[PDB]
Symmetry: D2
């Protein structure tokens, strides 16, 4: 059993591509959360062992170890080391898992862990010449998609884009467009209800951005990706992304900017400081699957995590499965034997509404599950993301109070 | 106490910039090692839990999670996950530490962990437009050096390049140019001695590369960066890279291509299959320091790891401190109260001779310390690297 | 004596950098003028010999021979050849000069000639690798300035930017900041008066641009660079561009998009069609000067052109000297023995007001001088531009009617 | 009748892509020729009126008015102006035509005119962002081919590459693959014959280039693109670049580096200095054609220039039609009523052997026709090039 406790966390609002957070460097966006948690946790900054951040890109302002650039820029001590982790879409969850394992081994009492991604500010990348005056230029957008693909990998596994893998899972496990759109509508609706109830109040750190003009600042307080007008009716109208396909711009997540960080520690440091944790990390699991069906990653990761945690799915009160594509979430739910509309599933909305800043999303799921656990009868939550090139990562947590 | 065993490992030869491995994609470099260990460890490939690779770049062919792309391209099974780790210069050691912690927690019985870099094949990176028809273009070489530097970081901590941090450390801890150049001489001489004694034979997997003559292949068996001719007299003749400085092209490591991977597991999986481990991982420590003095990271890293392993520096038989710059190694040695010439230190040579493919180096120090330990009496080794922006990482291992 | 006649011409409005014309390809912007002149001149399109356009860039949408891409895209016949000319800032005048020389030799009866530049849409340029896996990248903005400079040229001649050459000429020929700003104010004022009198009516072809939204078009009717609020008082406040310098953002021209084309022919084709020309081209001259003093280029080009034309400066009723920097215009005027406020000089405004789309400006000066000649007593106009790296080009014309 | 004289001229050897001249900047290539002619013509450098250079690219070191940068860098005086001209493939011939017209008008007595290209050193070009954080990046090789193509042009005229226009012409005018390959064989054989007879001796200025061995220089004296081994049997064995097509890597010119410049003046400046001209320029003609069939541009260009020169094709002793693709030359020959094997046509070899540095080629045809005319009885030569996007340019010259 892992033995690490979630004491606190914060996230930025998630911005649209070229949106509300497009002017903020990914190291500054992570730095804001790291600075605010250091200042307000109750713990001594000198008890901090390490900062671990997920980031799927690392070509840009997020290069040369985002975690350490971010903690220095935010004014945390030079004595505090950091490390950046990449497991694509599961990066923010894998950083928390790595901190939880360190803690459970007795190597540090207190870690900051999460993820950050500026998909707006992701650079163009250009291959070096293989010979003098070479005429071949490979130029890629690092925002998203395959770049410099290995021909040996492509020959074994194909070149399906992430949306195409959603259509694959829809075909493989028999998920209809109607069910996908019904799930997409309920993600938007569940976000809107949670927002109205005040669910996000203590979860979001608003971000001051340049408002243009000169000297003018604006406060970003709110998630920018949600489309409350996207009801079933509007989603049913949208074209497929591909011919004979089920995935649309409406039942898929989007490209986004955002950061999310949690503070983890052993039980003893909280006992010594008189600070109560939100939740205990019990177990994690990582699995590989066929790249073309990457979206069913979570089914096997969830079963292995529950088995390591010694609990049954019926003891779980709250399920965060990242909503990359509505059809891959429904496919996971089907394979786990759950109804498409199970009320435990992303009960405050998911990525269809909130967006998917790759490195940050798994860390948002950790924080939102720990917070959501405080409002329900059952003790356990599972958090899970599918991963590009076919992986699943899952983590089980338990409410403390 | 960590509870992970090193069972096996292999590294490529380390190539010079645009050198013997410049044609090999970094995922393929890593993949060659993943495949050969999968095929020859004596463990079932199905017990492998995860592949953890250090990589400082991740902008190019090493992008989008090198670990997973490398294991798929090498033909390991699709069921096997992977993740990539970046702690700059300590990346390959941090990958092994994370796999060791995973194992120590009971989360999988068997991990492949190491690092890879193609500093040859690192791409150019170019900022997005911050406005329509912007005339601002920020273009950088991802090979090495600060790119898209943060203004708030530069204001608090400066913009010193890594060689300058070497001079800063030399100045701060009083390390003569002569002592630096002797250390650099010893590293070249120690590499050449170990090479002729056959020390590297089962450490290196040779790599088959195109020679370019419409079908012609060449086998790279040997580290390309060593300079046997570099004796104390030759090194004293070279100029400092910066005025008032003690750091030269000759007492500094280089820019390099290469990969290194180890197989770690729990005790029980070795016992069940009748395979003995080389060494046990006992402890690790990561510390931050002033970025300006990043070179002395190892000192506190080494002391914390020894205190966590419950041993004295006197019980150590083998010390692998990465040779980013001769003067930062000597400063770390002075800070720990060791002679500049202590024969436990980089006894088979170091990065001055072998080179520094950043992601791969820490994984190389794990492998070579685990191998080196088999040959000596004292049963403990320390492995440590300084890290750009001011970190030290150290690991303690015990011969089985 | 040259023997070529200006029958017609048109220009686009000149747009600011990322301004009113930033969405229009330079080949389309030239194509609009070439199409409108073909359709409205009175001449048969089949009598057209050739299209000659100035363009200082040719790396972008203006690459691979702008003139021929432009005439094809505008729907002129495949039978009509074209050629693109580059003499930096004098490119649009040099294209007219080359057409005038062809005509005067009897090689074609009718030419379209001018220039075009999209400084907005100018690409980034990146050097090929000199060796496999080379780490040196030379990346340049082709909008403006030195790119891939020759070290042998830089060692003989220095690396002074164009604004710095203005400060050089100000120092060399004793032009005060006060006189520069007085000239800049009167360029803005003379533009504003000409606009109010209707001077530009028959000179400008308005351009339909995408207005954003979707389906929305807007008509660009007016020059976008003029600053009528720039009076002496406002210009006196502005900082120098360089320390101890005289050139400012206000007494220098700017970066601009625009095209300008004239229709030239022999006298006989106009006699046969019953179409009267505006003016006769008499002579041109090209000179080189020291790169660092490039702005006095026009003094010697003007004297040689007047000498070839067999006229005296006192017979000239109209002088267009391109206003690259107010101090280089004043330096030319001083060297020619003219007052700074000579009323013949750019009497409808110059580039300080109108902007400087490099390839187009010399062709605007040809068209605006031919049109301006129709409103004055004296028969002759001289048109002249200074050129980057130290050249002067001048042309003398004579009113026909 | 034009009234300009060709007094002198020189060209570099033409290099292969990444070949013998790939280290020479195009301004330096042009500058070497400008300087040697300035120093050895026997004319005063002070009577030179202007330098006119053809260049199809102008994105790179050839940017910002190659003529002026080349003459300053070569040490010609700052008083000497220059301009660059682009009519794609006819650029170098169009530069000479424009200088000839200038002279014919009485605007200067003496011009340097030609062309230069470094297709080796042509840069990559990259579109500006059309919106903040745009994900659209258009990147092209300026070496050759359509870049930032206009949608309205593609809709009316298609997107056929130059080799495809060769196939289109072959198909349209019925040119066999066999005839194409024989022409390509004759060009290689005719180049090798002229080389061994010493025809190129005073045409080529050798170029000194770095060999790369810390100070080592090599003299390039010889055209690098010729393939003497390419006989009719070898050429018939190669595949078409496109299905149904007759165009191969062997009956098409290549991608190349090189420069060519001539000295033109009026009659009186020769008479005043006692220097005889090689030839008089009599006339030129530029025509447009369908872009799809750009290869047959020369036909009408040649007929209009002959009519302007007042001569019959029967009075011509020498015909330089640029060999972009064997089949477009043969189509032009059929359209003019000439045998495929007429010995007046590219008698010393053509672009199939010599290569096609686009800007330089037309300037090379002027120089080689002016030199070739000295050796033969008929006193007229025609020079012509087809042009991408559908143009033909031709010039008629007379031996003095």
């Amino acid at each position: 059993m892992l033995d690490a406790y979630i004491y606190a966390g914060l996230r930025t609002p998630f911005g649209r591509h070229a949106g509300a957070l497009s002017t903020v460097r990914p190291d500054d966006l992570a730095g804001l959360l790291l600075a605010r948690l250091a200042e307000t946790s109750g713990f001594a900054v000198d008890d901090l062992e390490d900062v671990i951040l997920g980031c799927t890109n690392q070509a840009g302002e997020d290069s040369r170890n985002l975690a350490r650039n971010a903690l220095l820029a935010a004014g945390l001590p030079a004595r505090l080391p950091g490390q950046t982790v990449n497991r694509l879409c599961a990066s923010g969850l894998s950083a928390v898992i790595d901190a939880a394992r360190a803690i459970s081994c007795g190597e540090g009492r207190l870690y900051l862990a999460g993820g950050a991604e500026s998909m707006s500010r992701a650079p163009f990348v250009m291959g070096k010449a293989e010979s003098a005056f070479s005429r071949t230029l490979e130029v890629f957008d690092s925002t998203i998609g395959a770049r410099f693909a290995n021909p040996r990998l492509v020959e074994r596994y194909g070149n399906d884009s992430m949306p195409e893998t959603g259509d694959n899972v829809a075909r493989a496990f028999g998920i209809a467009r109607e069910d996908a759109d019904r799930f997409a509508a309920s993600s938007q609706a569940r976000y809107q209800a949670a927002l109205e109830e005040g669910f996000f109040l203590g979860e979001i750190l608003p971000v001051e951005v340049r408002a243009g003009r000169k000297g003018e600042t604006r406060l970003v307080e709110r998630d920018e990706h949600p489309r409350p007008q996207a009801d079933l009716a509007a989603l049913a109208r949208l074209p497929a992304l591909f011919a004979g396909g089920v995935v649309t711009a409406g039942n898929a997540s989007g490209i986004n900017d955002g950061a999310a960080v949690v503070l983890l520690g052993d039980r003893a440091i909280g006992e010594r400081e008189g600070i109560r944790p939100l939740a205990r990390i019990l177990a994690s699991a990582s699995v590989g699957v066929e790249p073309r069906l990457m979206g069913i990653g979570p089914q096997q990761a969830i079963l292995r995590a529950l088995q390591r945690a010694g609990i049954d799915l019926d003891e779980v009160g709250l399920i965060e499965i990242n909503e990359a594509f509505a059809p891959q979430v429904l496919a996971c739910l089907k394979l786990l034997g759950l109804d498409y509309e199970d009320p435990r599933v992303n009960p405050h909305g998911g990525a269809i509404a909130l967006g998917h800043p790759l490195g940050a999303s798994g860390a948002r799921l950790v924080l939102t599950a720990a917070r959501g656990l405080q409002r329900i009868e059952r003790r356990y939550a599972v958090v899970s993301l599918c991963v590009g090139l076919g992986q699943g990562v899952a983590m089980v947590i338990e409410r403390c109070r």
